[PDB]
């Protein structure tokens, strides 16, 4: 804890103030076109539902082979999006594969 | 059942067809939007 | 000085100095967003600026007893050449390995070769 | 009669959740009218227009590239569109020598697979010059 | 205190000047970068080489 | 005074919004004109070594950049514009720029000759 090694820690995290406050200004952008966007897809996947309240379909009682699919970025420093989405996937194929059906999954990003 | 089918084509197939011939048939004020949807984006590795 | 050491001598080593400040400012955001959110003129940018500092390399012939290579003496007309394509863009489909420790630009792509020889 | 006619696409919506009378859809085994107790089918679209019949004075034109209807058990119509496009920002200059073009390269085709492909390309280029 | 020349500031590139554990997450995420475009050149470099000969 | 206040209120602009120049084009068209704007007069205020200006002709310069004259250049062709306007202005413009160094003041009747100068040289400059 010198005169020295106190300025250079010091001088590092001024750094780290300014970069990550321009990386919100940039990131508050993205998701202010990316909350329009989703209004007008909003009504797309009305329609995908409507056909199964009236229709009520289920899967009866037994596979021989089976999907699963699980969507994310590329893109890290999120939080708890992409560990909220392989841990429930690995909270299914031990569900499954016990009643002897198939699994496969695909990852898309 | 009709020619693409017993031919080794699909609707998806089809969709994509349909769609870039009429988005090319557009005039040239409306091009951006042709590059609106971009579907070449999305990447394609294999396991193997 | 452009009155000295000529108006090509000095357009060379006032372009040197302003990438390498110019890749200060990237490494701070590496730390952050990682190499791989960056955008393709600034990826473009870090390639080129330890393409740079690895040819600003060179090796001594009093360097014969520790490291083992041969050394270099380059003449002042090949290294304002040399300098002058990396800043163009005339050797960027090449390993960053082929410019540590040569003499010459035409060292380093010598070097560029048998490393895909031997791959 | 009590019709909640739903249409989209993935860019803009266009007339939704609104009671209109009468749908046109473009549909391989041809187009049929959508009659107030319509029999539910889920049958997926051909290129063509939708011209939609309204209340309010005159009817609206526009075209689908290839769609999807799923009209339910109730009176609920859904129609989708990858391309839900007005018809006014097309331009016929380009679009006719693409016709002639196709069938110009149909005996180029080795294969089988995209022979036909370009009988697929004529369709579609064959879709809007009768709608033009 | 950084609205004055009296109080102190910072430089560019200062993060890889201390050497802490965001300077060494930083000198390493390069090498996990160009080592790998190091072999997508290099496998490419016989048939460039070919290429210029050939025109 | 004239040119330079509102020369030092916009480089002054530019200071705070000068974080965001480095990863950005997802931005607002405001903040991407002070990225513009800020960074053609620090172009202007680079000079050579051994080079003092006389004081009419700087006021021809920093005309020039501050007034609009600038935007539709790309910026390593701003070090080359002002070397060009300030020769053309120097040898066919000679009269106009002692009558700044005697009346002092920027009249009308030469805040509009100077636009029939700078528009009528940024045609035929870029070739």
Sequence with gaps: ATLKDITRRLKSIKNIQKITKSMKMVAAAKYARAERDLKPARVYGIGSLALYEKADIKVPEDKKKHLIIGVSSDRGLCGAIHSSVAKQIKSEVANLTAAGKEVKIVGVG | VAYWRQAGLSYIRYSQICAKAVRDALKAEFKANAEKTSGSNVKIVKVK | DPNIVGSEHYDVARGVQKILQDYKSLQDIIAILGMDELSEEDKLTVSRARKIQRFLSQPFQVAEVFTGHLGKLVPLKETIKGFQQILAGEYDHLPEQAFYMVGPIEEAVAKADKLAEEH | ?132 | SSDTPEGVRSGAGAVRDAGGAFGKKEQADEERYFRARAREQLAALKKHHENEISH | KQVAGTMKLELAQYREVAAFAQFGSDLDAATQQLLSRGVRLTELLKQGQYAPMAIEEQVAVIYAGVRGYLDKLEPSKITKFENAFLSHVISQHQALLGKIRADGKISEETDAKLKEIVTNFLAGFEA
């Design chain 4, 1 to 132: 009669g009590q019709m909640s006619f739903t249409f989209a696409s993935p860019t803009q919506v266009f007339f939704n959740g609104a009671n209109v009378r009468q749908v046109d859809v473009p549909t391989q085994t041809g187009a049929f009218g959508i009659l107030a107790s319509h029999v539910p089918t889920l049958q997926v679209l051909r290129p063509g227009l939708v011209v939609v019949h309204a209340e309010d004075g005159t009817t609206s034109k526009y075209f689908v590239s290839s769609g999807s209807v799923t009209v339910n058990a109730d009176s609920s119509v859904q129609l989708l569109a990858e391309e839900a496009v007005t018809l006014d920002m097309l331009d016929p200059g380009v679009a006719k020598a693409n016709l002639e073009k196709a069938q110009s390269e149909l005996l180029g085709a080795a294969d089988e697979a995209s022979r036909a492909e370009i009988q697929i390309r004529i369709e579609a280029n064959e879709a809007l010059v009768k709608a033009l």
